[PDB]
Amino acid sequence: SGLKKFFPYSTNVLKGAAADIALPSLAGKTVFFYFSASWCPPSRAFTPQLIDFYKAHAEKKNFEVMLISWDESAEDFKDYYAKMPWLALPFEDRKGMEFLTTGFDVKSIPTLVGVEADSGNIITTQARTMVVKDPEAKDFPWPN
Ligand SMILES: *SC[C@H](NC(=O)CC[C@H](N)C(=O)O)C(=O)NCC(=O)NCCCNCCCCN
């Protein structure tokens, strides 16, 4: 996996209440790293739009979303991630969050960066705006 250079400290990611998801289940997909936090109103307001997009398109367009949390506390993470249907980098992997923030040049939230799982190549850094501008995914994955 292609993405293994982006997970130095977590071998499993979250889905719902579990922590049994491994990286091979992302083979062949585009993976969107979603930088967000509940303390940020703009981020909170973008999340539902991304939820509708995910329900409409995740299967047909073969993508996954992974929350990379800038939340303030373990409790805030738990409550905010519980609103989401997709994956998350575990909160206790703070170092891994900082690694990805630096690696994808994330200076603000919400930010959504799409990567090809098999190569690890960044495909798009504009997915936040394009989920809003292209809600039917006509031009997905919006390659930069
Ligand atoms: S809620 C957190 C904030 N996000 C926004 O305000 C939303 C931005 C935009 N309208 C959008 O909707 O995407 C956020 O992520 N703030 C963090 C941040 O931007 N810090 C970077 C500050 C860098 N300042 C540079 C100063 C250099 C001067 N020489």
Side-chain angles (χ1 to χ4, degrees):
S1 177
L3 298 170
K4 251 281 199 191
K5 65 178 180 170
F6 297 130
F7 296 93
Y9 308 107
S10 287
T11 64
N12 290 120
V13 300
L14 307 187
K15 185 169 180 36
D20 67 337
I21 306 304
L23 299 187
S25 61
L26 307 174
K29 302 193 167 193
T30 300
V31 177
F32 292 89
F33 289 85
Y34 177 35
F35 295 82
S36 194
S38 71
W39 62 262
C40 184
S43 273
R44 291 200 317 261
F46 171 69
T47 288
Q49 295 164 309
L50 183 58
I51 294 173
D52 290 345
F53 193 92
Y54 186 83
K55 294 178 185 168
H57 307 300
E59 193 82 353
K60 289 164 173 191
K61 298 292 185 210
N62 199 37
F63 68 85
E64 189 51 86
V65 169
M66 195 183 287
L67 175 62
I68 309 306
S69 167
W70 284 11
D71 284 290
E72 305 187 83
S73 67
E75 319 76 57
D76 290 332
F77 176 89
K78 189 176 165 181
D79 295 342
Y80 188 40
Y81 177 52
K83 302 177 175 181
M84 302 172 185
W86 49 62
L87 304 185
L89 181 72
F91 187 80
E92 296 294 293
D93 185 4
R94 301 281 72 204
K95 285 185 199 179
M97 174 277 284
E98 298 292 346
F99 183 89
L100 292 167
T101 294
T102 294
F104 294 143
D105 302 325
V106 181
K107 310 284 186 177
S108 66
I109 58 168
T111 292
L112 193 64
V113 176
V115 180
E116 182 189 14
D118 289 353
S119 64
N121 288 17
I122 296 159
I123 295 310
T124 185
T125 62
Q126 61 185 328
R128 183 292 194 80
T129 140
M130 294 312 299
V131 159
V132 181
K133 296 183 69 166
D134 185 24
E136 294 298 319
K138 301 171 177 175
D139 293 326
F140 176 93
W142 320 290
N144 284 44

Coordinates of all heavy atoms in Angstrom, one line a residue, residues 130 134 136-143:
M130 N -14.7 21.5 -4.4 CA -15.4 20.7 -5.5 C -16.6 19.9 -5.0 O -17.5 19.6 -5.8 CB -14.5 20.0 -6.4 CG -13.6 21.0 -7.1 SD -14.4 22.3 -8.0 CE -15.4 21.4 -9.1
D134 N -19.6 20.6 -7.2 CA -19.9 19.5 -8.1 C -20.6 18.4 -7.3 O -20.1 17.3 -7.1 CB -18.6 19.0 -8.8 CG -18.9 17.9 -9.8 OD1 -20.0 17.8 -10.3 OD2 -17.9 17.1 -10.0
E136 N -22.9 16.4 -7.7 CA -23.3 15.2 -8.5 C -22.0 14.4 -9.0 O -22.1 13.4 -9.7 CB -24.2 15.5 -9.7 CG -25.6 16.0 -9.1 CD -26.2 14.8 -8.4 OE1 -26.1 13.7 -8.9 OE2 -26.9 15.0 -7.3
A137 N -20.8 14.9 -8.7 CA -19.6 14.3 -9.0 C -19.3 14.1 -10.5 O -18.7 13.1 -10.9 CB -19.5 13.0 -8.2
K138 N -19.8 15.0 -11.3 CA -19.6 14.9 -12.7 C -18.1 14.9 -13.1 O -17.7 14.3 -14.1 CB -20.4 16.0 -13.5 CG -21.9 16.0 -13.3 CD -22.5 17.2 -13.8 CE -24.0 17.1 -13.6 NZ -24.8 18.3 -14.1
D139 N -17.3 15.7 -12.4 CA -15.9 15.9 -12.7 C -15.0 15.3 -11.7 O -13.8 15.5 -11.7 CB -15.6 17.4 -12.8 CG -16.3 18.1 -14.0 OD1 -16.4 17.4 -15.1 OD2 -16.7 19.3 -13.9
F140 N -15.5 14.5 -10.8 CA -14.7 13.7 -9.8 C -13.7 12.9 -10.5 O -13.9 12.3 -11.6 CB -15.7 12.7 -9.1 CG -15.0 11.9 -8.1 CD1 -14.9 12.2 -6.8 CD2 -14.3 10.7 -8.5 CE1 -14.3 11.5 -5.9 CE2 -13.7 9.9 -7.5 CZ -13.7 10.3 -6.2
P141 N -12.4 12.8 -10.0 CA -11.9 13.4 -8.7 C -11.3 14.7 -8.8 O -10.5 15.1 -7.9 CB -10.9 12.4 -8.3 CG -10.5 11.7 -9.6 CD -11.4 12.1 -10.7
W142 N -11.6 15.5 -9.8 CA -11.1 16.9 -9.8 C -9.6 17.0 -9.7 O -9.0 17.8 -8.9 CB -11.8 17.7 -8.7 CG -13.2 17.5 -8.5 CD1 -14.3 17.8 -9.3 CD2 -13.8 16.8 -7.4 NE1 -15.5 17.3 -8.7 CE2 -15.2 16.8 -7.5 CE3 -13.2 16.3 -6.2 CZ2 -16.0 16.2 -6.5 CZ3 -14.0 15.8 -5.2 CH2 -15.4 15.7 -5.4
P143 N -8.9 16.3 -10.6 CA -7.4 16.3 -10.5 C -6.9 17.8 -10.6 O -7.2 18.5 -11.5 CB -6.9 15.5 -11.6 CG -8.1 15.5 -12.6 CD -9.3 15.5 -11.8

